[PDB]
Amino acid sequence: QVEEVLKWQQVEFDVPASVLSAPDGYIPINNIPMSGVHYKNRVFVTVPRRRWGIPSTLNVVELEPPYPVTNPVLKPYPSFELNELRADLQPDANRLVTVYRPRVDRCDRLWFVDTGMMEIPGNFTVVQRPSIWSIDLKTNQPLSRYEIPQKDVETGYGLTSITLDVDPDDCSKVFVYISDLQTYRMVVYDHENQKSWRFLHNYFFLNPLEGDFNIQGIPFAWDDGIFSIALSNPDPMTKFRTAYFHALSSNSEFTVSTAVLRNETASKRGYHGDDFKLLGYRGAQSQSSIHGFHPETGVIFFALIQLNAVSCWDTRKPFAPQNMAIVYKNDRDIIYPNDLSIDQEGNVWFMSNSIIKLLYTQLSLEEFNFHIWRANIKEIIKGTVCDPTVPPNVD
Amino acid sequence: QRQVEEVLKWQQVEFDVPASVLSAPDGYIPINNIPMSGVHYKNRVFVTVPRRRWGIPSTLNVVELEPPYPVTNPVLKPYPSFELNELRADLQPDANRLVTVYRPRVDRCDRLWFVDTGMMEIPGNFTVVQRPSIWSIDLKTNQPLSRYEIPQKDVETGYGLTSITLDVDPDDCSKVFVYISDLQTYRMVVYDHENQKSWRFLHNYFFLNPLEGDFNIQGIPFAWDDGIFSIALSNPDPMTKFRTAYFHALSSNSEFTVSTAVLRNETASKRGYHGDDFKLLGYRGAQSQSSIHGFHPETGVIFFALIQLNAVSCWDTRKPFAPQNMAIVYKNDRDIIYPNDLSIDQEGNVWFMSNSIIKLLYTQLSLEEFNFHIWRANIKEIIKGTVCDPTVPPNVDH
Amino acid sequence: QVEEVLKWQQVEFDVPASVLSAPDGYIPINNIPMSGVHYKNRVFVTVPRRRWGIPSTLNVVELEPPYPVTNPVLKPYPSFELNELRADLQPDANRLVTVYRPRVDRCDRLWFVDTGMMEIPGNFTVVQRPSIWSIDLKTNQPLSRYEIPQKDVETGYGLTSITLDVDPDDCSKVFVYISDLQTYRMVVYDHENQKSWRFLHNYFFLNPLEGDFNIQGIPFAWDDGIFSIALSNPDPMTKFRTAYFHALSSNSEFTVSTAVLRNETASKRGYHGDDFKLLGYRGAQSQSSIHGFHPETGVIFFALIQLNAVSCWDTRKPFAPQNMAIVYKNDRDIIYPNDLSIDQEGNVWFMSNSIIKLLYTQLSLEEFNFHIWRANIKEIIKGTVCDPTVPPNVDH
Amino acid sequence: QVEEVLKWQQVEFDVPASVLSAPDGYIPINNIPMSGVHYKNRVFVTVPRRRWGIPSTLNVVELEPPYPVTNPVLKPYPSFELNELRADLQPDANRLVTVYRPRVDRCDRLWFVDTGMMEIPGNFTVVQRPSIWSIDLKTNQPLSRYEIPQKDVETGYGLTSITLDVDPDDCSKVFVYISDLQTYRMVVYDHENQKSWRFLHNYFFLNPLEGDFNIQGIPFAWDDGIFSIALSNPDPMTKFRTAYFHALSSNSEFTVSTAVLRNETASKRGYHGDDFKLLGYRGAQSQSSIHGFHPETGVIFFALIQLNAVSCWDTRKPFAPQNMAIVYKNDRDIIYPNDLSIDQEGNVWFMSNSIIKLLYTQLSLEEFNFHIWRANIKEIIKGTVCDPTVPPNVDH
């Protein structure tokens, strides 16, 4: 019911021996993948440059059964020419510095953010300003690029996640919402008008008492804020969407209408009134990383950090623990659910990269460290409370 | 609890009419007269006595307010007159008279609204005098403005039409919708004023919860099977100009919501399947079955009349619907038997009433004691510093 | 083990061609059989009059191999004369208007209820008052007929199911409990004294949340209440029984002593107190229509509406999902299980009628819409939790 | 028994006229005082440079009856020569740029931080790095100045509040804990060893839901973190104390042992484990700004933002809303309670500066906008739950 599509002991690249032979050109233990998203039998895998020796930040892998496809070599997408790191480390609009979590739209486009920053522990290296890209997946050619101005974000240290707001009819009318978990802000991107602005709000912060974890016997505390945003279907009478959002270090989910997010003058305010609202409590130890809203079912899928699992929730039901169900659980293989994503084919995709092991312990290249699963949404929710045909619980 | 006023209190209900009615056999009986409502308008309070038994001289009545409070055993005056409240001996349809009226509501445009059930519910003998009909009363001149008889296609008798909720336009006042809660046939009848047309909704959520219908007030155990009872409307949505209808059955610990866009739609009412248009809001709490509730337009707070807990609770509609986001603002085990009504006036006050119906129905009703009570409390002042205050943040689990 | 016995593409009757050649004396799409019960190689199939063009409300079919017998012709039972529809529509004591679910007891009698009411879309027509019948099965001769007074139930709108309580010794001492899913009541009938009284309770109602269904990709919601009752074996000392009852729109099962049900004085109360009991929660999407109690094994068989299945439960074991087992499942054929009956031979019987296809989509007469099955109880519960010799999964 | 000591309509400075006439030298509305602290009949008032037109950032007022002293002219302290803002805006270790909340110890010293930064809306101007001063209050001469290195804090943007940990025996052995409400950190200053380090922790952050205010009908939200720290009496043997700390936008109070704060190695951990403990919940709408510990009684006083009030708590009684009492409430005058200090004479001192009227509304210089109050601690707690002899209301 949940199949493991991809797994790695370590990450390897399809680049010239020139790059592999050069000193500190490729360090295996340094290459931690951060996302894997799906598009027509192709899975895009990112390796953010938090370390030296990372040949390509954006990558692709071709799918062929049977699964799991073991240790697939990553090919620098769209071309190694872009994923090359300049030796002079200077700004370049035709180079990809660091990419985290891309998303695929219905228009055969790949959207991502090049942070332009390398978070090497010891030497944080700001190469260039953060940029929003779109790639045509039919032609494998870059379409648009937008550099995010200083007035919205200073560096791009925390721009690790994005949510796409594409009009159902016009494929050109696109907004993008970026979650900054480091500076506790959300950056809205008007693609159509090549404009952007930023929101600041108390709800983008962590909950002081809810940033403590114990995973695989390792304890740690994080202060990471707004991390994921999930958009409902456009309202029939208003055309706007509910933005479900949460901090990494929180057991709470909050909501805001896109009408607020799409409005620049609203961002510039000192006080947002009661535009941003609390949806409610997700449960004990129910801190989530990435969550996604499946349009056809109206079901939100949560990646649960502490519980080493993936849960779901039907949006029509009241937001309550007894109205959510765990669809998958794996204490051995889910160490940190780094990414969750919903494809154009009715599947929920999720990924674990064992980052906690690396950070706080020793990762072992003998074992399989990085995993990618998939599940058919309609099939996975059938019996459960996440099924729209199943009534909510009495509590 | 220590800033809520007991405005009116009776031991019995007496009337102001010609002595020919009062002296005639079975024209008036002490125990048979029970008011189901207390409503406030500009220093005069409308009280109604529905005809559950014989000897009810008048149904819809009015009382003038004068300190000290509580005003003890006031003499009820038939409103708008006695000549619309006079029971016919022939019992034919009186298109200009009032048989049984339950809970009226006061809108912003100085009007009173109520339903003429046209049906008397005497134990042993049920009598359908006339068809159900709704009124509008000019409270300035005391003159009836409109009457509308509801077609058989919507309600058969008017047996359970014991509750009304008003949906008046913010700007215009000719555009008025009404939502009547039928707790007996388990339905909601909607009325379109400007068009003078009415239709009805049937739904599973209008029924009681089989397990949550058992009560025990004053050591008297009983169970009722009554359905949809009260509806409360949020302020119009700035983007859609529609409202959220909050509704619960009498015998339920659950609250449900529905957009007024659905309720105001005739073609939607004739569907056999309403989809996900009606939704569960959530659980009110253990032993939190509510009779009547109201939405305060200014604060955005719903006040619940709690049946089992002998209390009035509040909830800020901005906060998630959960017991820890609710507070009891008034509680009276000795004086509150059955909170039969709750209404919000135009002056920012919560008006709630207990009529001791349980003791009459299942026990002894003594006229030596006080059996009827009307209360009022300042909303902005009673919620200040509680979870119900919009400026106070919501609560969380751990 | 579980076998299909009778299945129809459509239903036709063995009646004069005069009724069949009348202006709409038979419309094929309007005839939906609601029940099928067993007695010594005979099966009674009922077509309640919910539309126009139905010749016979009560019928009979003969069991003759091979199974499943294809498109059997329905023979009006006991006769056509009684099953005939009066064009004058006047109350008639020796006729039959609408019959739902008959039952068969240990004293060779067939028992049913004629509602006397025809629920046609546009015009609901009450022809006569509801009537309970006995039929001597050996002779085919109507034994008794009691008309239910206005004091107990007004219309017979929802008297679609009955459950028989026969004394284990004397056949004259019979109590019949009728389920009313429309007005939310249980009508109790004393066969000897020829009296009756009704019960009203909160537990006969639907559960507001648990009344939505999606069968064959078709969403719908019903407000249907108390639908089926199952009577246990008389307690060896008190000689009373436990009546298990559920609403159609409920996942909950409830229990009541037969001492309370057989008591007229208790029937006129306003508050029954602690008498009616909740047994528990059957499970997610475990709403059931008609269920029966097998006396020999002490096992209840449920017909599950949403799960498209038939399940069982050993009454000795505590009521819990883990202590229950699904004995048959058919997502293709079982759309809505309309009847479940237990014959005198130790078999469980269940039927599907494709009713929701008629109501919300269109019915195809070129496909088999109506199905009846039989299962041997002792063989079917053998390797399951329902076996009285096997221990429970949960001690509760 | 709570008496108002000082009040201003507007703040004025005793300074050469050439400074007052200079272009944007003195803008009355910009001069919002932020602290008033008592030492031997002298109250030190600060005006942090968050706007242009502030002649002097640290000032002194000489207390004399009758109270309240209306519109006292602020005298620059120690002198105007240190307080005067350099036009060229270059760094200078002999200049005071921005001082928020000074504190007086037992050793006749005035301790404060010059943030070195001007938080002017539109252009924040970092003139110099933040520094920590001590001034001998007997001679009015500065005793020491220490620049906080860039490893510990970035700019001094949020170094608006300090707490003294003075050795009960030795005056030369001091630690100062500084709260950074902007970057959510604590800076620890080792006075004897002229060293410093920082602590980062989740508990220094605001609580997302508890940062919404409405004072005087003015709705606003702040994201302000760790604001105040209050130290218990030292352990007789080890001399370690309990540090009571809270964020501005939080209803929760936390504790940590000074054993931890005074440990440079502990501050370099990525994970602090169980060292920082949640003490508990202060009550609905009980967001505190500044609080203080009074050694003689063991009572902590809180300045309450939303409640326009000062509350207290006996540290011996469990930390719970009912174990706390409001000792002073003034909705008219207390608008933003900007400071609370505990002097060497058993008094509690508190201040309201109406900052929120300047920020989100308008300030009228005809009204008294800045107020300073004092109260005798033992007299103010006599009857209340805060009295050490009175029993707790809850065991918790």
Ligand SMILES: *[C@@H]1O[C@H](CO[C@@H]2O[C@@H](C)[C@@H](O)[C@@H](O)[C@@H]2O)[C@@H](O)[C@H](O[C@@H]2O[C@H](CO)[C@@H](O[C@@H]3O[C@@H](C)[C@@H](O)[C@@H](O)[C@@H]3O)[C@H](O)[C@H]2NC(C)=O)[C@H]1NC(C)=O
């Ligand atoms: C885009 O957003 C801007 C303001 O942000 C919000 O707008 C709406 C979503 C509302 O929820 C509002 O409360 C919130 O501030 C704004 O440019 C624009 O419309 C706002 O709508 C306000 C209410 O109608 C209105 O406020 C007006 O001005 C203020 C300063 C006062 O004088 C008020 O008395 C007066 O009503 C104003 O048009 C504007 N708000 C502001 C602050 O300028 C909104 N546009 C959309 C949604 O299309």
Ligand SMILES: *[C@@H]1O[C@H](CO[C@@H]2O[C@@H](C)[C@@H](O)[C@@H](O)[C@@H]2O)[C@@H](O)[C@H](O[C@@H]2O[C@H](CO)[C@@H](O)[C@H](O)[C@H]2NC(C)=O)[C@H]1NC(C)=O
């Ligand atoms: C101050 O800082 C160190 C970390 O704090 C604690 O360390 C544990 C002992 C425990 O109390 C935890 O709650 C917390 O993490 C602490 O270890 C240190 O003690 C010294 O630590 C040095 C390195 O960690 C080491 O050289 C010594 O062995 C240890 N000294 C001992 C245990 O006597 C604390 N005290 C200092 C530096 O004086």
Ligand SMILES: *[C@@H]1O[C@H](CO[C@@H]2O[C@@H](C)[C@@H](O)[C@@H](O)[C@@H]2O)[C@@H](O)[C@H](O[C@@H]2O[C@H](CO)[C@@H](O)[C@H](O)[C@@H]2O)[C@H]1NC(C)=O
């Ligand atoms: C910050 O990183 C510096 C960069 O040095 C190199 O950068 C890349 C080109 C890679 O090849 C990488 O592997 C190299 O380290 C480091 O200098 C420095 O760490 C140490 O520096 C000394 C002196 O150069 C060197 O001998 C040692 O091996 C280390 O690399 C690092 N500084 C900090 C504080 O993290």
Ligand SMILES: *[C@@H]1O[C@H](CO)[C@@H](O[C@@H]2O[C@H](CO)[C@@H](O)[C@H](O)[C@@H]2O)[C@H](O)[C@H]1NC(C)=O
């Ligand atoms: C009453 O409810 C109807 C539900 O059938 C609404 O119909 C909807 O309207 C759209 C556009 O006209 C159709 O595509 C579709 O029939 C849909 O269900 C109808 O609008 C509504 N009436 C009013 C006045 O709101």
Ligand SMILES: [Ca+2]
């Ligand atoms: Ca961080």
Ligand SMILES: [Ca+2]
């Ligand atoms: Ca009822």
Ligand SMILES: [Ca+2]
């Ligand atoms: Ca029905």
Ligand SMILES: [Ca+2]
């Ligand atoms: Ca801040």
